[PDB]
Amino acid sequence: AQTEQPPNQILFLTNLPEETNEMMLSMLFNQFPGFKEVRLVPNRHDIAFVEFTTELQSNAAKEALQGFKITPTHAMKITFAKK
Numbered sequence: 001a002q003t004e005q006p007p008n009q010i011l012f013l014t015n016l017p018e019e020t021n022e023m024m025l026s027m028l029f030n031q032f033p034g035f036k037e038v039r040l041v042p043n044r045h046d047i048a049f050v051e052f053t054t055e056l057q058s059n060a061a062k063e064a065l066q067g068f069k070i071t072p073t074h075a076m077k078i079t080f081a082k083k
Contacts, residue, residue, distance in 0.1 A: 002079040007055035010081040011062060012037045013048045020045040024070065027028045049081055 001012045002014055013025070022040045029035040029050050034057025039049040052058035070076055 002077070003082075005080040005082060007025070007053045007059040008080040008083065009055050009058050010083065011050040011058050012079050013044065013050060014077040014079070015075060016048055017048050017071050018045055020048060020074075021027040021049075025050060028065065028068070028070070029061055032057055032064070033052065034058070035061070050078075 002012055020037045020040060024030075025038040025040070025048055029038070029052075032052075034053040035050070036053055037051040039051070041047050050058070050061070052061065058080070062080070065076055066078050068076045
């Protein structure tokens with residue numbers, strides 16, 4: 001199961017579209033000035049990871065995009081990943 005934590009510069013994401021692509025999440029999260037990268041799971045697509053310069057900026061992106069419909073039936077869940 002996914003878990004929340006104190007802020008971290010890496011996020012773990014769930015309930016994504018069955019057709020999610022790295023470029024979609026990059027375009028969504030690159031709106032924030034601390035985004036760096038994404039890592040999809042190309043055998044499921046419904047989960048992914050995202051990476052940032054600092055924990056406060058991934059936190060800002062998390063609060064900004066938790067619940068965001070990537071498509072009408074796929075509200076993005078977001079959690080902090082762990083290192």
